[PDB]
Amino acid sequence: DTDSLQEWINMTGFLCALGGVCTPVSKFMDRLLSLMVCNHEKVGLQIRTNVKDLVGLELSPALYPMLFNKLKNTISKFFDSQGQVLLTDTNTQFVEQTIAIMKNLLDNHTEGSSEHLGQASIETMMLNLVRYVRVLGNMVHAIQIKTKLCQLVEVMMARRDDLSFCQEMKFRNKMVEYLTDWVMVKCLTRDLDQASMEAVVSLLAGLPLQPEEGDGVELMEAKSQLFLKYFTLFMNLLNDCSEMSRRLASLRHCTVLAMSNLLNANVDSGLMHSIGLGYHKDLQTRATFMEV
Amino acid sequence: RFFLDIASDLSFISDGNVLALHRLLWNNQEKIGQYLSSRRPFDKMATLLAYLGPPEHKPVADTHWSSLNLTSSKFEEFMTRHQVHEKEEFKALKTLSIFYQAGTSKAGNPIFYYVARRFKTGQINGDLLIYHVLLTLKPYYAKPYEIVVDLTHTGPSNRFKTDFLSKWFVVFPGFAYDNVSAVYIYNCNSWVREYTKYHERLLTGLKGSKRLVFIDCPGKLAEHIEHEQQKLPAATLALEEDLKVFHNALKLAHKDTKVSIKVGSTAVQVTSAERTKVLGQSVFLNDIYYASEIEEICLVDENQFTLTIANQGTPLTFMHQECEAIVQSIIHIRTRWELSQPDSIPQHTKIRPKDVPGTLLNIALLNLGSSDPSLRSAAYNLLCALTCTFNLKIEGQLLETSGLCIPANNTLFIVSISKTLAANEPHLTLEFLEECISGFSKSSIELKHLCLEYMTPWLSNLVRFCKHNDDAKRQRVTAILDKLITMTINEKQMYPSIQAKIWGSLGQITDLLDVVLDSFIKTSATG
Amino acid sequence: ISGFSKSSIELKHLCLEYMTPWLSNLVRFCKHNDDAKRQRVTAILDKLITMTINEKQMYPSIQAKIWGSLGQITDLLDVVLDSFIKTSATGGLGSIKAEVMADTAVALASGNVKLVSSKVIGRMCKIIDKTCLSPTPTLEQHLMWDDIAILARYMLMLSFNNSLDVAAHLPYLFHVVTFLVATGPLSLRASTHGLVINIIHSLCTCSQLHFSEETKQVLRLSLTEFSLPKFYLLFGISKVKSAAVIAFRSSYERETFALTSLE
């Protein structure tokens, strides 16, 4: 029977290769999205593995539009109503597959970047993604899902020049607010925090902080408030780091860069809360600020 | 022969030296005019001086192109030359969402939506606003276009200054004004009416203008712009929805007027039911009061009450048969906002690096003598950077490198640096000395002696900032002496060294003595 | 000195304050026929060193008032600094005594620079030269190796702002570097690298030499090229990110040497 699976993955890859010639193609892609969570006994395991390969690594770049949209619609049905999510194991497996799919699809970075950009608003897709993952819970598989999402965010920040969003700064700001809740088995927990730090660092790169639109006291007051919140959280993290030594050293090294970016963006609303640790007791903080 | 041997054979100065030169020019303007007459030079200087103003009298956060020439061609070349396109504040103002192009009218004119309430009174806000308007409007003012002025919730915080209001009528080309097909003015209020009453003279071109279409009912906007082409802000639309309407309302004022009160979950909208004159046209005004602005809620009687709004001299007196229902409707949502809102937070002064050169010199020089060599390297990097960017004259004694190994006993280097800065740059002594005194109390013992040792060259500069024309500066001098008294009393340790350095150098300078002794007399009497 | 141990800090400062005029007369009590007074003078200097290493709070006041005053008088200097050598021979390298002696070295020379720098580089040259009379295959197994090591630390702390006078002592100073490129442990090699960097740094940032602009450009280029990792591998320091960090690492030989790197 393994021969049958051999030609089956062969034809699946062939079709994924020549979809660029091109509708029946949409039906083909919907069958793939159905077969990602194909949980049939004795084959489905390797089936989904092969799927995770093929559409991961060999999908035609001009077929890049349709896939994104279809996934969006699927996770649009993941939310039961009004931002609330419904948790099923099938949805969980969908999420776990989907993360690796965009990870590989982004990281290949072959020719044909234009076919990636002109159509893709992956903004809402990731927003729904992190909103489902945040409510997953706290356990081993959940931690693994969370950290994989963190590398995905790191990658798609690394490729920010190619892609396109409707509102980039608002999207990144919402991503920062969602991610920094995750900062604080333990070995994993520390790994989650470790990956989340370069995720937040990549997000903060040149980000003017935008307050969430309420009525607000004013723009400047709420910008100061967000600056104070993020700065205090980072200082608490670095104080815990100040006391596996290589892990803590890397954690310090990236938290330093987080301070550097977050101060370099909002200098106006930002010196006034952190010019008073130029006299700080710990010389590590003082040195760090002292080149920032 | 020795004299024969010696006799035969790109840099921008700091802000303070230019400021001193500017003082010397301005205080003697008329006389240098007379002597230069004894012709283009005096003139160039003359306009230049005016553009600057008389000597410093304003926060440098505030700077404005004045109107002595005020030509559009110049303004555009000035903005393009310095690449204002690239600055982050312009992208920030784009994020503020003011004057965004949206939609195309029934006459085929593209429409620009100016939101007045999102603007706060301020200088860079205003000038970036007018340049943003010129840049966004630039593709389209060669052709007919239409604008919508959203005047929801506009108060004195959103006003244009008179000089700034005069700028809008001169910087744009004439056919930019002429291509304006229609101006839809939406939700005009009584404050805007007052503002026009103070400003009929500059708005005389709009006085009686038929291009001013006042959208006194929201459906009237559908008569000129399609609803799908309507892209007004979401909060503006939410101001119209789910409004609890009470007709037959009266405002009791100097003039009692007929109004109607629509109470929504965030605000109260009082809409005038009788037309009043703004810009030569009779309109229906509507004053908007957010729930965050309501000051006091009370019921004088069922037929009449007074409502107090923040920053008002008198509460507005409202007379209606249903005043009690209005009071409960307002007070329920107001109290649930009161529960919903967070507490008060104290806020600090906005700090930007180009107006704090003293504190950064203190954080540099103090840490330059610390124990940890990495900290000394970082301190060397800041000292080089400050002497570079702020253009202080150091006579080329600093250079940045990686791998420099700094000795722990470098105090002579620090003192040489501080003495050279006190010689070549006296304009920041007050903030520098104050921050040094402040950092004294939070420093270690060897660092405390270091702090004494590099602050003592600066004390001879206090003669310049004493007896000055500005009394606030000599007040600052006396305050500094007060903290010096305080630290001398509190620190019983280092007391011989404190007397040997601080008061020892202070007593050596005649004509500074008298304020010092007078401070001694007043502070000895205390206690 | 005996009374200085028991007094209070406020008394201690004034105690410094009246001992400091008396130290100038020690040149009278040196170079006499009786050497018992000479051994007592060296014992006094040992007591001063003892108090400097023992006390931490009044350490900068000590470094100024005592040592900068001794640096003023020419004749004592040698029998001062020689004692430091035995002091630095006393105990071990990478200890408290050695490091505080390294700092006190520049305090001694702050008052007078050219003569103290002359003495230090002259003793480096002599201890280098004297190895010929008892030749060994390598300098590390030589008997006067420690004087090579200890004075090397003295050249590191004394090179920040012309404390080793660069305007007149550059050939000898380069010559020592050539004879000490990648010899010894990690600390001495890193110290040699820091010495080279500080030499070039003080060479460009001083108004005494009044160089031309293009000369300052090529020196600025040279400083950058010595900052490169290629010159780390030339200097024998590998795997170390910052030479300045491990130059002081005790506070907080396996690789062979090839002559082409020296070229």
Ligand SMILES: Nc1nc2c(ncn2[C@@H]2O[C@H](COP(=O)(O)OP(=O)(O)OP(O)(O)=S)[C@@H](O)[C@H]2O)c(=O)[nH]1
């Ligand atoms: N306060 C003020 N400053 C202005 C104004 N226009 C230009 N400036 C400033 O002054 C400079 C122009 O000075 P100006 O004397 O007009 O020189 P010019 O533009 O060559 O014009 P000229 O008539 O003197 S030959 C600009 O760079 C800008 O900094 C204005 O209307 N008010």
